[PDB]
């Protein structure tokens, strides 16, 4: 099964449950009812300004079933996204506290639909 997962072409689309984009200009007061933001709250990763200044974000929720079957973790997906997108993107994942597997993606510093374009370009050919 491990070799089977290491051979099959697994995109982000086959693993994601649903996705959406939001406008959350204050990560401290995230509008999407999560306190895992403690990371950003105490993160010294560039706060905003030229960084998380992008208020719009990509909130994508994974399912537990395909993450279990493909033998994947949140950190591996985040690392693949970071490697494929450089430092233009910021990814914050979710620990194994609930079944809701959350990836929040922000633009690091065309305007707003570019996030949707890279959402399509990330569902298509990430090659996890």
């Amino acid at each position: 099964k491990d070799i089977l997962c290491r051979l099959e072409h697994t995109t982000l689309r086959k693993v994601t449950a649903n996705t959406a984009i939001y406008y959350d200009p204050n990560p401290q007061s995230t509008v999407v009812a999560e306190d895992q933001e403690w990371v950003n709250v105490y993160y010294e990763m560039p706060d905003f300004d030229v960084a998380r200044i992008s208020p719009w974000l990509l909130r994508v929720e994974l399912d537990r079933k395909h993450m279990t079957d493909r033998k994947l973790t949140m950190e591996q997906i985040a690392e693949k996204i970071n490697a494929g997108f450089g430092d233009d993107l910021n990814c914050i994942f979710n620990d194994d506290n609930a079944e809701k597997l959350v990836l929040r993606i922000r633009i690091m510093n065309d305007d707003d639909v570019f996030l949707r374009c890279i959402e399509s370009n990330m569902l298509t050919d990430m090659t996890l």
Binding site: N18, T19, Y22, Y23, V32, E119
Partner: protein, 117 residues
């Protein structure tokens, strides 16, 4: 979460488009034909359900109880009106028909209740 609907203008009745406020850091719906602005209701401007967990009972209509070619049962009474007879059928849809789920529609007149077994 939930779906996002198309916002509409009030003057020229075209589609409103999302944009940011550089001053107050809020989302505003703005037209492109005219110059009209509206305060947003939610942060979710785009959504995409990919796992496709849809409530099939919404797509079910009550009038399908009048179909003679649907099979009936007196084994499952209606929860609302207590009528003992109800028709049952499959999903009848794509992005579906991988699981054989029965959907019941009570055939009693002027109740039209549907449910899932």
């Amino acid at each position: 979460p939930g779906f996002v609907g198309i916002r509409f203008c009030q003057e020229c009745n075209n589609m409103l488009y999302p944009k940011e406020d550089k001053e107050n850091r809020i989302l505003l719906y703005a037209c492109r034909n005219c110059d009209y602005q509206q305060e947003a209701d939610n942060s979710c401007i785009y959504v995409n359900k990919i796992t496709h967990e849809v409530d099939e009972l919404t797509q079910i209509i009550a009038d399908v109880s009048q179909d003679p070619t649907l099979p009936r049962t007196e084994d499952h009474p209606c929860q609302k009106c207590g009528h003992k007879e109800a028709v049952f059928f499959q999903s009848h849809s794509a992005r579906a028909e991988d699981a054989m789920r029965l959907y019941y529609v009570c055939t009693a007149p002027h109740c039209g209740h549907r449910w899932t077994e």
